[PDB]
């Protein structure tokens, strides 16, 4: 629920071990980064080329699938103008429950009496009046807090709700405007925009301004056509800090948000070192950045005789980003940054430009049509950045803290990158009867990161399809309308390797930068025995070592699909099957032994394979009730495997199992751990079990696999694979008279997750530091009084090693939640037409309203169980004026 709305996208499941973002294409010019800053309302169609034999034309860098976006245009003979709006509200729903001061004292007392140590000899200001019952179990009679938190009476005690302190209701605004045009010789379009979002976590926001100009002009009987596409944005986001949900969980609730004076409260003594989260949000208030961005296109069309076009575009993609990050001095008990002030003034720059010149041909003779086209392509990326730094400022405000009003030391940074590409392609088409379709492509391409041994890479493709209902032996099946077979075989492969994969980097490293421990791989070495003076000579150490035989990560993907259409154009939908196999995945390997420093050579060996099904469907039919419905829906299926991994990189577990099992054979990211099946409920479990290290009345049992008294590290198995089956979705549309309702449902069945709020909410001592706040599930833990809970006992120390990976930390992540529901109301004809306008609307909608989960999940949100930005509920009350 980040206000920027960024998204992690995977196409056809996981394809490659390293970076696999898809390639967006916005009006011919490509860019691999963005789309949460682009104007998301000038959209004409979004093709998604999931295949490889259909996406092989666009590049080597289309291994992860390409998402083709196009923008609007002027229609012939229309002058229309729209005006959208919205005003929303964001509400918080997924608050994890934490235990307040009385439950905190009860949990501390329960831990100390499960130790047997006197609970009144604790470091915190607690008083316990307790005794022994006749059945041996200790019962806490009275519990009393102190008045202040320390001896010097600086901080009072209270019961502060942290997740109610850093959280507000956040309004969301939106505006739009769009003007079109269009004649028989020209067209135009001109949009605007504004979108302001204020997040549910305090003092984070986002706002985007936008613009767009599109046009084209055809001159001499359509033999000369010039056009353009341009965009200009400005986003300005204050970013949430790192670990602000976890900090809001960690700090005990007895700490107040303020001191005796106006300063912030803190853990003054005994309580663990966690910073006040309200202070973290109050100091990360003016780290605002500013991001401009432009596009460009200038295509020139030319037809020499007939049916034979030419083209020459020119892309452009500029974007800079200015920031100014402050740091402040703080003081909360023992939490102090030692009186330090600084300001860093970053700046980054990007630049792309392309050029391509296709030349297509088109012929239709007999019952045959064909389309052949050839063309080249160019690219160049020129990134940058630099920075600054100052220290020890006097006044503490975001306008005094410019780097000239400082006194302390200073630093400076900076770098620069690059890229190039040049290619040639081709395509073909054929039908021969309007029955047997066929298409062949081929793209020869060579980048500037490939090794010296081979520049240019070749990528072939074959794709064929043929209809059924146009064959005359199937005319007896009249209720069917269309049925199309298709099959394809392509070969693509991306090149998102590092820029220095073939270069054998040497670097100065004088040693001005900091290294703790005294490692400090420097090149200074004072000669002449001076022992003083900063005039030392310098030299070069080696950074890494490159091979000259680097190579792209090729994938060979097949496909088999089936179309259908029935019942006088209804029940439309497809059914596909696919099998991809990447063959050269890059893994950087450390240099063995005698190679010494700088042995990290990038080699390419590794293979993954994916296979699954897709099945979409849609039923649109008007009923006799006076109603019209439409129900699109889709069901996917996914299955992964790693074919082979080369060396000891498969052993230590950078990708899969945690250093104890090989990954080869199983899926990607699968963790391997113990099996926890219950608690030591009875006394005879200490000898019914087999040679457990930590065996008490709690301390969950681990099953034997070798059945030899094995509580060794030879009892782990594959317990968790994150690739679920049966992912699905459903869109439902209703049309009563003068009304419309749109609903949605999305879900997935059979998901495993790794919860780390369960480790915080089921164990008293599992994290490193002590006396942390927890989640209030452990207050009903196992006791001699309550033997009817699966929560283990509350011990003060980790006697039995319970922080191991185990089946106790695997939940059922299956869910089904309504993404949005939207009700509208169209104003009728004559009342709208009295105001000289076409269409009017007053709609209402709400997002993320509900969710249903399984029994097997004790949490709050089945999508992200960990400590990320939460998902809030929106409620929108907008309109749509259409002239």
């Amino acid at each position: 629920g980040n206000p920027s709305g960024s998204a992690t996208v995977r196409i056809r499941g996981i394809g490659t071990l390293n970076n696999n973002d898809p390639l967006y294409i916005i009006d011919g010019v490509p860019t691999k980064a963005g789309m949460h800053e682009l104007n998301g309302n000038d959209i004409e169609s979004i093709q998604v080329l999931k295949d490889a034999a259909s996406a092989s034309i666009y590049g080597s860098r289309a291994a992860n699938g390409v998402i083709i976006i196009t923008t609007k245009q002027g229609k012939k003979g229309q002058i229309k103008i729209n005006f959208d709006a919205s005003v929303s509200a964001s509400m918080y729903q997924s608050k994890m429950n934490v235990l307040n001061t009385e439950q905190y004292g009860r949990a501390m007392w329960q831990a100390y009496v499960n130790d047997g140590e006197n609970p009144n000899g604790n470091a915190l200001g607690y008083a316990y009046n307790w005794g022994y019952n006749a059945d041996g179990n200790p019962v806490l009679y009275g519990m009393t807090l102190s008045k202040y938190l320390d001896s010097k009476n600086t901080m009072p005690v209270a019961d502060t709700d942290w997740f109610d302190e850093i959280t507000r209701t956040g309004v969301i605004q939106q505006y739009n405007l769009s003007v079109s045009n269009g004649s028989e010789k020209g067209s135009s379009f001109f949009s605007l925009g504004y979108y302001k979002n204020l997040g549910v976590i305090k003092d984070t926001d986002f706002d985007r301004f936008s613009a767009r100009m599109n046009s084209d002009y055809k001159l001499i009987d359509d033999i000369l056509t010039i056009g353009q596409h341009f965009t200009l944005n400005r986003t300005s986001e204050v970013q949430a800090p790192g670990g602000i949900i976890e900090t809001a969980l960690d700090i005990p609730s007895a700490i107040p948000v303020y001191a005796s004076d106006g300063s912030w409260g803190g853990p003054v003594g005994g309580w663990p070192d966690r910073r006040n989260p309200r202070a973290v949000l109050e100091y990360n208030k003016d780290n605002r950045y500013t991001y401009w961005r432009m596009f460009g296109d200038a295509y020139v069309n030319l037809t020499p005789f007939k049916g034979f076009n030419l083209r020459s575009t020119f892309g452009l993609d500029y974007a800079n980003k200015q920031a100014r990050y402050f740091t402040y001095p703080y003081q909360e008990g023992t939490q102090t940054n030692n009186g330090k002030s600084a300001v860093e003034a970053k700046q980054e720059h990007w630049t792309k430009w392309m050029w391509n010149a296709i030349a297509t041909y088109q012929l239709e003779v007999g019952k045959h049509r064909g389309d052949v086209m050839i063309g080249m392509e160019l690219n160049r990326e020129d990134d940058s950045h630099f920075s600054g730094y100052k220290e020890d400022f006097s006044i503490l405000t975001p306008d005094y803290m410019w780097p000239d009003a400082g006194s302390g030391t200073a630093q400076a940074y900076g770098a620069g990158e690059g890229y190039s590409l040049v290619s040639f392609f081709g395509k073909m088409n054929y039908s021969y009867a309007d029955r047997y379709l066929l298409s062949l492509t081929l793209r020869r391409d060579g980048s500037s990161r490939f090794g010296k041994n081979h520049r240019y890479a070749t990528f072939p493709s074959v794709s064929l399809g043929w209809r059924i209902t146009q064959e005359n032996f199937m005319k007896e099946l009249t209720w069917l309308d269309d049925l199309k077979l298709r099959a394809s075989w392509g070969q693509t492969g991306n090149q998102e390797i590092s820029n220095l994969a073939r270069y054998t980097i040497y670097a100065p490293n004088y040693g001005t930068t900091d290294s703790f421990g005294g490692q400090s791989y420097g090149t200074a070495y004072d000669i002449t025995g001076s022992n003083g003076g900063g005039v030392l000579p310098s030299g070069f150490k080696r950074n890494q070592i490159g091979n000259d035989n680097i190579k792209w990560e090729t994938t060979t993907q097949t496909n088999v699909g089936i179309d259908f259409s029935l019942f006088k154009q209804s029940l439309y939908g497809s059914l596909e099957y696919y099998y991809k196999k990447a063959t050269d995945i890059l893994t950087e390997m450390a240099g063995v032994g005698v190679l010494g420093e700088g042995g990290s050579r990038w080699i390419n060996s590794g293979a993954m394979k994916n296979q699954g099904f897709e099945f979409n469907l849609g039923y649109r039919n008007k009923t006799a009730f006076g109603l019209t419905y439409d129900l699109n829906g889709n069901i996917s299926t996914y299955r992964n495997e790693i074919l082979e991994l080369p060396e000891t990189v498969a052993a230590n577990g950078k990708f899969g199992g945690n250093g104890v099992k090989s990954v080869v054979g199983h899926t990607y990211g699968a963790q391997v751990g113990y099996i926890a099946d219950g608690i030591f409920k009875s006394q005879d479990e200490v000898d019914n079990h087999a040679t457990q290290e930590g065996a008490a009345v709690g301390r969950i049992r681990y099953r034997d696999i070798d059945h030899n008294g094995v509580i060794d590290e030879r009892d782990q198995n594959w317990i968790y694979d994150p690739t679920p089956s049966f992912s699905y979705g459903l869109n439902i549309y209703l049309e009563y008279k003068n009304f419309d309702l749109t609903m949605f449902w999305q879900g997935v069945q059979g998901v495993d997750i790794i919860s780390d709020v369960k480790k915080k909410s089921d164990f008293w001592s599992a994290s490193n530091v002590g006396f942390l706040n927890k989640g209030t599930r452990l207050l009903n833990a196992w006791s001699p009084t309550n033997p009817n809970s699966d929560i283990p006992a509350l011990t003060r120390s980790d006697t039995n090693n319970e922080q191991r990976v185990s089946t106790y930390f695997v939940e059922n992540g299956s869910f089904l939640k309504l993404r949005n529901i939207q009700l509208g109301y169209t104003v009728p004809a004559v009342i709208s037409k009295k105001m000289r306008m076409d269409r009017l609307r007053f709609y209402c909608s709400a997002q993320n309203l509900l969710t249903i989960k399984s029994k097997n999940f004790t949490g709050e949100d089945p999508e992200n169980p960990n400590f990320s930005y939460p998902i809030p509920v929106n409620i929108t009350f907008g309109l749509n004026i259409g002239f």
Binding site: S420, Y506, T523, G593, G596
Partner: protein
């Protein structure tokens, strides 16, 4: 448009084709120099300072008991694993210096003699550094893989073995670059950082004298000692080539271990540490970042043992007590001592680095361990806190330029050569060790004012001019090498060089079990615990091309 593709250059770095250019030299040689000053962890110094706590002289200086853990397993010689991490770390940290020296040598091929008359000197310096690191690693493991060629591609560094060269061939390949340095080094370098003719002579003497003690098989036991190379040993230690260059004996033993004058006549080739030199905190001796005691805040590592202090105690004749010293607690107030006691180790009731405001007591402010290791501090690598030498970049480190080779070292090795040759020339080695003892006697000029306020008595009386027994003079020079080279990482290697190492270490264990609590359970097995084992990860990665040390 292929020319469009080769138009972008990487920014902010230098690639690997212009690094072999003749104008960017006198940078790689300084880079190969600089790995000795910086490029070591506080757990692993290049002085071989932590890997000799098992040498009857150090209690490891534990703040806690098992805060290092594997160091305590190393000091007890029981339970050390082949998959330990200190061993792999010191293996990688020596081969990094090998890598830098080889890259500098590989760049030095493409020069000429027309404008560059210093090609032989720079090749000699880089070969000297490579041979020095190889000699240190052969001291550590004794079955290592030696790379000697400079024009070797990285594709075949993996396909190398250590069984292809036996021990005399390995010592000869170590001696190759030292002898080539002795061929082409100048007598006097103007800067004191670069090595000279005397340093190459001393390292050739070290390599030859370690080649002399024959090994002859997979067992690490002593066999028939070769005499053939001893002529080359006594040839390569002749005193006129050490007089050439001015490298002689200083006036005081407390002179070279004092930062107010660093480079003297005993500094044959030091390791130059400096402060306030442009970088972040200075090229300080971060290897001794734990040796400073509990006065500055942490970390009280490397405290000396009681057996060395009892080895300091002499008699009223001026001679060491031959194995009748550990029976009594050595006290300065009872009998005569050696004056180097106050130079090496600080005792309770004495100034710390000759500072009267820092008299040593036995409270918590001198040892975090209360009685687990005692109350001793080391003064060989620590200074007074009123230095500009100290700077606390999370650790207190000194700028004392650490010396690997001294004039007393080459003198005692010459004495060892003359006594092992024993072809009539015995008494001149006796005269030489008498000169060394007389220098040690006439070296006290700093602590001799402590007789009034404390009450001390010390005298080092040299012996007469008579050819004694062979074994008696062997024991005398071993006693002198023990009392001179205390806390300077030169005990365990000499014990394993002489071979008689297991029995004396077991005797130290059974006589120090009553002194320390951890030493009650101890043991040093034969033919297994002398050298450190080859690390498991290198053997696993080599696919059997490497080999294992004997008994492992």
């Amino acid at each position: 448009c292929d020319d469009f593709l080769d138009r972008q250059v990487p920014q902010g770095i230098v690639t690997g084709d212009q690094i072999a250019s003749p104008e960017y030299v006198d940078n790689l040689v300084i880079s190969a120099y600089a790995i000795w000053a910086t490029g070591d962890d506080i757990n692993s110094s290049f002085s071989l300072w932590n890997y000799d706590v098992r040498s009857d002289d150090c209690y490891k200086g534990g703040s806690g008991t098992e805060d290092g853990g594997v160091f305590n397993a190393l000091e007890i010689s029981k339970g050390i694993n082949t998959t330990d991490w200190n061993i792999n770390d010191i293996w990688k940290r020596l081969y990094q210096c090998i890598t830098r020296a080889n890259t500098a040598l590989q760049s030095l091929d493409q020069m000429d003699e027309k404008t560059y008359p210093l090609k032989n000197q720079r090749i000699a310096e880089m070969r000297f550094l490579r041979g020095h690191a190889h000699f240190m690693l052969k001291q550590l493991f004794k079955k290592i893989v030696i790379v000697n060629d400079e024009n070797m591609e990285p594709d075949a560094y993996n396909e190398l073995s250590n069984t292809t060269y036996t021990n005399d061939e390995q010592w000869q390949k170590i001696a190759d670059d030292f002898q080539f340095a002795y061929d082409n080094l100048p007598e006097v370098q103007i800067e004191k950082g670069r090595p000279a003719q005397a340093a190459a002579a001393a390292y050739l003497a070290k390599t030859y004298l370690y080649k002399a003690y024959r090994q002859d098989g997979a067992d690490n036991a002593l066999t028939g000692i070769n005499e053939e190379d001893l002529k080359q040993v006594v040839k390569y230690t002749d005193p006129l080539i050490m007089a050439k260059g001015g490298y002689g004996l200083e006036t005081d033993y407390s002179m070279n271990f004092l930062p107010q004058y660093e480079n003297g006549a005993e500094s044959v080739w030091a390791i130059q540490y400096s402060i306030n030199d442009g970088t972040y905190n200075g090229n300080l001796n971060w290897g001794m970042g734990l040796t400073t005691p509990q006065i500055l805040g942490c970390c009280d590592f490397h405290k000396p043992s009681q057996n060395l202090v009892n080895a300091f105690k002499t008699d009223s004749q001026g001679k060491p007590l031959f194995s009748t010293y550990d029976n009594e607690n050595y006290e300065v107030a009872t009998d005569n001592v050696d004056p180097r006691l106050f130079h090496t180790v600080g005792m309770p009731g004495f100034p710390y680095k000759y500072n009267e405001g820092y008299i040593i007591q036995k409270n918590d402010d001198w040892s975090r361990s209360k009685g687990l290791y005692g109350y001793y501090v080391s003064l060989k690598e620590n200074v007074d806190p009123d230095c500009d030498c100290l700077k606390k970049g999370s650790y207190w480190a000194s700028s004392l330029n650490h010396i690997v080779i001294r004039y007393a070292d080459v003198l005692l090795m010459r004495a060892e050569a003359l006594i092992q040759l024993n072809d009539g020339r015995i008494t001149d080695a006796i005269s030489l060790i008498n000169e060394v003892r007389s220098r040690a006697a006439g070296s006290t000029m700093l602590i001799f004012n402590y007789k009034e306020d404390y009450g001390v008595n010390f005298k080092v009386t040299p012996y007469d001019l008579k050819a004694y027994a062979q074994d008696e003079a062997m024991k005398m020079l071993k006693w002198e090498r023990r009392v001179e080279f205390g806390m300077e990482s030169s005990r365990f290697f000499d014990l394993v060089r002489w071979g008689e190492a297991k029995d004396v270490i077991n005797a130290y264990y059974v006589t120090e079990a009553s002194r320390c609590s951890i030493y009650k359970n101890a043991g040093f097995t034969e033919n297994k615990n002398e050298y450190l084992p080859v690390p498991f990860e290198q053997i696993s990665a080599s696919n059997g091309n490497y080999t294992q040390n004997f008994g492992w």
